[PDB]
Each structure stands twice: as structure tokens, then as C-alpha cells.
Amino acid sequence: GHIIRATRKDRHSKVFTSKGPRDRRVRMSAHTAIQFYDVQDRLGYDRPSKAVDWLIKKAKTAIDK
């Protein structure tokens, strides 16, 4: 579960995942972004990625199942 050096004109790193290499961007539905950004602003974080870090740790106990 690790990071993959970039191949072109982009130099962003992909990640190797359970299903293989994958880009680090995700699109959210309008339905879902509304609540995600509510979570991020409640925390005050400027970078989205730190909010999902926060969510993943809080969901730790429910992960591991």
C-alpha cells in the first residue's frame, strides 16, 4: 500500500491499492460534497485531504470489521 513515481507531462504520484494503481483524485456527488465540506469547515481545515484523514481516524473502530 504505497506511492508510485509518476510515468509524462504530469508528475503526480499514483498509489498502488488492493486493485492496483489509482490516481489520487476523487469526484464526489453533489449530494455528498455538501456534507463532506460541512465536516471540513466545522474542523476549519484548508486542505480537503486533511478532513478525510480526520474522518478515517474517527471511523477507525468501525473499520476493523
Partner DNA sequence: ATGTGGTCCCCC
Partner DNA sequence: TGGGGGACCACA
Least CB distance to DNA at residue 10 (A)? 4
Residue 5 binds to DNA (criterion: CB under 7 A): yes
Among candidate residues 3, 7, 38, the one with its CA nearest the CA of residue 24: 3
Residue 58 binds to its own copies (criterion: CB under 8 A): yes
Binding its own copies by CB under 8 A: which of 8, 9, 11, 27? 27
- Dihedral angle over CA of 28, 29, 32, 36, nearest 10: 30
Angle (CA) 9-15-16 rounded to 5° is 125
Binding residues for DNA, rule: CB under 7 A, are 3, 5-6, 8-13, 22-32, 46-49
